[PDB]
Amino acid sequence: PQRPPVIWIGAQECTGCTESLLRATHPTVENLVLETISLEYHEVLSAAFGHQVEENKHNALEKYKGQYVLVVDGSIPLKDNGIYCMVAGEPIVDHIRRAAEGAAAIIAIGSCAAWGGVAAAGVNPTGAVGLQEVLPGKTIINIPGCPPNPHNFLATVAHIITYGKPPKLDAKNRPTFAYGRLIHEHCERRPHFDAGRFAKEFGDEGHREGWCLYHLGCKGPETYGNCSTLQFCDVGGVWPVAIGHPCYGCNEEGIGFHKGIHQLAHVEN
Amino acid sequence: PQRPPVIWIGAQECTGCTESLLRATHPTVENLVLETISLEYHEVLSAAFGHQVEENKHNALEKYKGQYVLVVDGSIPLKDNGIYCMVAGEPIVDHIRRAAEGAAAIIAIGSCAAWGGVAAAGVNPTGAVGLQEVLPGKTIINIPGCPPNPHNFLATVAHIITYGKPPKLDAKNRPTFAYGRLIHEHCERRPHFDAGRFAKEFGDEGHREGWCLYHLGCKGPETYGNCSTLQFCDVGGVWPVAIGHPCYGCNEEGIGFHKGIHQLAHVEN
Amino acid sequence: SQRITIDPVTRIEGHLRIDCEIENGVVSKAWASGTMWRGMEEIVKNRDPRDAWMIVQRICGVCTTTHAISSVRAAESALNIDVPVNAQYIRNIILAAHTTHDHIVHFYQLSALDWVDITSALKADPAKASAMLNGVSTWHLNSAEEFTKVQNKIKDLVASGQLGIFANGCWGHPAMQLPPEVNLIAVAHYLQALECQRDANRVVALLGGKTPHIQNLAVGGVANPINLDGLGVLNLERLMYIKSFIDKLSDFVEQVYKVDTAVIAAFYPEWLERGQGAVNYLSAPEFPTDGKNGSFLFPGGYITDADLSTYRPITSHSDEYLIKGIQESAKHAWYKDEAPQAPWEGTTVPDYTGWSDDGKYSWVKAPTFYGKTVEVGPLANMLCKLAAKRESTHAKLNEIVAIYTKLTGKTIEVAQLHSTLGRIIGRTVHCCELQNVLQDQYNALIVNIGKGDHTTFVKPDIPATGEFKGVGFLEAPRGMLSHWMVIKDGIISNYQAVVPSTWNSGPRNFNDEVGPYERSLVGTPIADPNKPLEVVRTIHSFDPCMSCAVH
Amino acid sequence: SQRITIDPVTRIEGHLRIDCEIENGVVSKAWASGTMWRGMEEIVKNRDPRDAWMIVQRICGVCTTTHAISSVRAAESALNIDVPVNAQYIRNIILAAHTTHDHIVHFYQLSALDWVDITSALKADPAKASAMLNGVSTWHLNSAEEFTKVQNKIKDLVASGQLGIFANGCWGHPAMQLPPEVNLIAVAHYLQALECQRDANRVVALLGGKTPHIQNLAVGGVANPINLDGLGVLNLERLMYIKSFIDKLSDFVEQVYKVDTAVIAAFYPEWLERGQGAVNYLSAPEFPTDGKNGSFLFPGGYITDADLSTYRPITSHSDEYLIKGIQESAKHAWYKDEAPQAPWEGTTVPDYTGWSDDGKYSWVKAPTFYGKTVEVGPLANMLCKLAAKRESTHAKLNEIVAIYTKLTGKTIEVAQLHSTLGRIIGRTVHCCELQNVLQDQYNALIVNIGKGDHTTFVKPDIPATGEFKGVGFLEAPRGMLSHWMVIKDGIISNYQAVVPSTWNSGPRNFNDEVGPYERSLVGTPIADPNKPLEVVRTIHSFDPCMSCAVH
Ligand code: SF4
Ligand code: SF4
């Protein structure tokens, strides 16, 4: 039987989003690429290179027109006519716009593709932007995080495959099963927050009792995600706060990579 | 190289506490019995039976006197001179008293051994009691739960082996790393509790959004444990509340098996 | 005539004593005795019917889930509740995954060391051991290198002088008949089995909230909240995780467990010719798939005279023929009331008088079906399925036999299934068939959610006055389980459990007829009365659970 | 004369373009070009020094952890902070576990398909393949049955008509030299590698809080709270969990990866005779084990003229010889300031002029050490360790060579390590030695906690005025990494990263001398200019990461 085709394009990425697939367990990456989808193009894993891999892409874009899921990883640099990301001698924005034309669904994976991410932070040297800004007439499914839990992506794709439509999305086009609630509104350290039990420095008494990390700069109060529940890596109990470090707000535009680590969630300076 | 000896005696048990070992992953039960300890006596797993397994018990008591960890699973029935639990023609209370005399450490695993548990509930047909009641002069480490996460037990044994003394205990002689906090004081649904977002019936709208289960009878507010953090089975996200059912208070004397499932916290009966 | 006692019988759940009279080197008479009682039936009395399942689940943690599901089924029976079909799918997946773990653990951790000599495995050539499985199994972990790693583990254990749970077993016993190579194969698989049973329980945990002792049931359905788009609930990601573990079970079950069953049978032919416990068999249908508590995936029924042509199908948990036949007698058990009692009118009044060969000698009651002594369990369920001409059952049995034939050049007929090995084969067949139940029920859940049904729970009405009776049947790993609840004025006025090991381990009944364990031992040859391995082999084949038997 | 271009180069991280001039069928000149820039050095400017690591870790998610640890080390250097020894143990475990995942994925997922033909695997006799490894490896997953399962997966993939990421690979290429049986072995190990690397990352996750991109660091130590008696923190149960995954890595590394390295060498011996990238090699010491940022488990050093007797050891991260030698030039890179700059004085001002063969042609800067080109990475680190007479490195190398000699009857001399295969061998040796680092550091942590030391963090004093300069070195999976921070009036006034792939992939330098990639390609024969597999093989041997190279 035939597997649904996926085309994966990397723009200004660090490859963390692809790497997240190597931690996935349901499905694992091997079951993903052999059983669940047909990964028609991915530069990190493709046996083919150079002229042959672009041949694969063209062949895929034509063969599966109207049926492939397009995934974009990384921000798109607008400054100086797109030259800050050139693949096969062409600005990545042109590759993306061409692929978007025949896509059945388009997913921006990671905060960079979702909203600019770290590449768009500070003075934004390359004029990096998110995918929706490059494809204004298209419906983009945003799966933010740096990187997101891979299953936030995989369960979205599974929903498209199994039930023939995207999952329910919020106002920012993020799937509600993963981004429908603030981390702070489903965090196991909320009782400590409520009581006033706060860590003040790494290694202090409260920190060593697993108290709330608000006053270390936790951005959970202003970040949507499932980090406190789904967590990471499927071993149980693993997310940044559980390990002892505040949420940095990497899911959330204007928080992650903008606010200082130890800047408080109610502080906007 | 030699391994620390362990003698495991089952009294009025359902075998759930032994079964918990089969879910463990650090160590797995095979690494436990081959590498971590020498399980000198355990009736569920022992190749020997009858006269031969009793020979094993006697030989181990003599060979390892002063060295072994004694583990007792199940309540001890005091009514009618101990006849409600007889092994090899002798009341289990005598097997336990005999083994306790030469133990390096004694652990009551499960709520039954810790405080009488389900066997001592209702009218208590057999005069079931916990281990400390049977051994008033001895220091008993209590590891309650029905059954506890197996690593609550395994990490306690590891502390004894590695550092040469038990872990820090609370006023009820329970290891603080596992029982030092109320479940409600480290529960991820606390934000919902705070906001008055309550499930009222299984399958209702709030229940299907993961709201707080207080009004379904959750005993988290009066139960000490690590169910919300360590959780169960090491797959991530698995504990009764996360699955959608209130805590029943199985860890806690006077809560589990005494109060109705849907009876509210702090309400007596 | 020599009298022997085995106390404790190990590698079972709970506390069991077996006594045997031996004449001319063969068991002539036997007694089975449950030696621990808790009074679970009395503990649960006078409570809200909704509360029962959390308490009576604690009858047993080996067969966790089973009493929980049977209890809610009993309350649902009493209250006339139709369980939502999604709750059935979820209950079914839990029971099937649990039973997979249960059977695997029974064959390897509980039973294998009756048939396998670990000291003999030290003598094995790992290359020869691997070679003899060529063409027998497609399993990927039967290499000489794997067997060498395993042999070295045994060697290091033995060299240490601390054999622990493996000390003083029946090593070198004359009834140990496997060659060194096959002993090594079995020990390797014993270790590999531990990973497979862990995967089975990960399925149970993801729906139950933990295991042992699930916490997702309710009178009226389940507590899992189905919402594909919800955070923190049973959504598509969680379902995918469940499926990932379901998918990991089949290869071990088909390529290791199923194969080892045939391997053991191959070296122990006379064990297809002894160990019959009964001529009557009972099983309940199981895995309901409609919204009316019926449409079972597995049939049940009643067989008499060890003859499949007597098969009487049972296709409903409301079948009055089944309900009216069941009684228990405490004539030879340590309770006060001795006449056969229907469980809705049952009592459990302790009357401990100590051991007497001709009197009371057990905490287990003696159940009967219209007065007959009956064996329950995977042998019973297999025979009913074979009688019903269930193709999947015949096919799986035939696959086991074909492996047996490859090894021995012999075959196995239905007549030979009434035996110690037949019982073990029935369990293996059950485990194999359950893998398709898991796939089917997961898929049915996905399909039903796709049709827009997210219903999981119907809230019961418990009338404040009036008397209501219910019975919950379940085909448990060890056989037909039934919980019997009487509700009066909104609370439980009587509760009685009749458990599979109660049927099998029950003592002599009102007319002094021995129970299946006791019957099965008559005729057993005994090499060494001080080390009665042959008795233990037959008893273990029933998968005893004494906390279940006695409660 | 004939010019070919490979754009994009796949199975690397990031965006790489390679050009080659071909004369008489052989590469006569080459160009390496990084084609994507983000300006990470500019993005981190003007922030609190404590914030940098969370931002610059995003230079790369393949070598996640590395930039994070280098960044905190740079700030600690600027502020004269002694990192608590417990924080060192934790950082060391994270780096060693990550690098294990990294090297395994590089050998199999990124590199193997340069040397392995999956269509040839279809022709293999799985029994023959298994037999080949008899006495060559003790790995337990080399059975004919395992190889059959793998072969059937390949068959199903091909038969489906959707080869996906395996489509249009160099199947049937003349340079593919493995017999069908060895191709099948390699594909089986490729799949098995995925499980091992997952276990390595479970170690990283348990200390890091997740991966990719750990979140447990701090300028001053780590954010892990050590408390054996604490609920919800780093207690003994969590440490045991970490140990359970550490214990799962060594068998695959030693019995599969180490072995496959020698097997590839055996069938491709001419690849020990080409692919030299430089005559100078540089590595930093790594894994500090005291409370003063020193006492490294691995030594570093500098070697010139491909001569181990010139070895100059580096055993401190504040060695001025190392610090003072490093400059970068953008003569041939797309930046405005072209004269060599030391990183504390570095600028990164974009000046894109398009690709040209004699002008600027890359976003990668060209680093030099005392004005010379240097190769960094596992080849450099291996040669430094051999020169330092480290017994463990010699022994591990000798183990690989011994397998090679068993297969070929030939040996491998130190001269032959300056090659494409030598580079790959260095990487394998590194991975093997890291397993000892993991065990050693875990043990050290457990012991130190037992001495009553739970300290994990010292708070930085960051002066509100004045200028402070710091450099953090780290021996990353691809070689020597350094982050350079200048702090002025409490904030970052300059930040420059010089990354291992910057050294190796850098374009022609201030003296117009080619970098390691560009030099390594000269002499390479090309069977098919349209499909230049031979170029890709050599380039992959450096493990390119272009997000790292360019940042
Ligand atoms: S999101 Fe974070 S991880 Fe994914 S690409 Fe952008 S930077 Fe790398
Ligand atoms: S501030 Fe952070 S740690 Fe504290 S409760 Fe909110 S999310 Fe949890």
Ligand code: SF4
């Ligand atoms: S505690 Fe709960 S689980 Fe452990 S024995 Fe007593 S009943 Fe069985």
Ligand code: SF4
């Ligand atoms: S009542 Fe129960 S569910 Fe609600 S916050 Fe407390 S522990 Fe959590």
Ligand code: F3S
């Ligand atoms: S930093 Fe990111 S990974 Fe989750 S905990 Fe905060 S959103």
Ligand code: F3S
């Ligand atoms: S019922 Fe028990 S298992 Fe934990 S969630 Fe409550 S204490």
Ligand SMILES: [Mg+2]
């Ligand atoms: Mg009963």
Ligand SMILES: [Mg+2]
């Ligand atoms: Mg730089």
Ligand code: NA
């Ligand atoms: Na026989």
Ligand code: NA
């Ligand atoms: Na060659």
